[PDB]
Amino acid sequence: MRKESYSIYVYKVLKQVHPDTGISSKAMGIMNSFVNDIFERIAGEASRLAHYNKRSTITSREIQTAVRLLLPGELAKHAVSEGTKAVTKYTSSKKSRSQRAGLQFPVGRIHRHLKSRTTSHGRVGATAAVYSAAILEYLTAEVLELAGNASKDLKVKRITPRHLQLAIRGDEELDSLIKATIAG
Numbered sequence: 001m002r003k004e005s006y007s008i009y010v011y012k013v014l015k016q017v018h019p020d021t022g023i024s025s026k027a028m029g030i031m032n033s034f035v036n037d038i039f040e041r042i043a044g045e046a047s048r049l050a051h052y053n054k055r056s057t058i059t060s061r062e063i064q065t066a067v068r069l070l071l072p073g074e075l076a077k078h079a080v081s082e083g084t085k086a087v088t089k090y091t092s093s094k095k096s097r098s099q100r101a102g103l104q105f106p107v108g109r110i111h112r113h114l115k116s117r118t119t120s121h122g123r124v125g126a127t128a129a130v131y132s133a134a135i136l137e138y139l140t141a142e143v144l145e146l147a148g149n150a151s152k153d154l155k156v157k158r159i160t161p162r163h164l165q166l167a168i169r170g171d172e173e174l175d176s177l178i179k180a181t182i183a184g
Contacts, residue, residue: 003036004113006136010035012104013140014159018148019094022158026145030164034143038179039110042066042132043117047054051121058089058114063132070180072173075142079135086134087127097125097130105133142144143174
């Protein structure tokens with residue numbers, strides 16, 4: 001798979017969880033790899049589950065199943081909850097797709113990223129991207145939250161590759177998430 005830039009959107013998320021904190025260029029690349037690698041696996045699994053439905057279209061139902069297969073229990077339950085919380089906010093609203101769903105991550109870009117993992121058969125449902133963006137935003141926020149905290153504990157005001165390692169290798173579920181993803 002070809003990696004896309006999600007850097008601008010990682011920043012926007014970091015502004016929600018740790019407003020006073022910055023992130024070195026090297027840490028950001030690590031974060032960008034993470035977003036892409038996890039998404040490649042979720043989309044990959046979501047795409048093959050889709051052929052089991054009549055319209056052969058990736059819907060949120062398939063994303064939710066992929067997420068529960070790939071993510072460790074608790075990370076899974078919280079991501080799934082945010083996926084549903086976003087689709088709901090989306091449906092019930094009237095007015096930009098990201099803003100409609102309450103999200104920092106770009107719904108349009110994710111929609112197109114999804115369609116590009118789709119097979120020749122293959123459509124992407126009208127809310128599967130809202131759901132995916134919600135998941136991706138959730139995981140990105142989990143890493144930045146922990147890593148920012150490590151940085152605070154270290155009296156620095158910027159996240160480096162060191163703080164990402166502290167956050168990930170010091171948390172049971174993140175560590176296994178990352179390890180599974182390297183075996184692909």
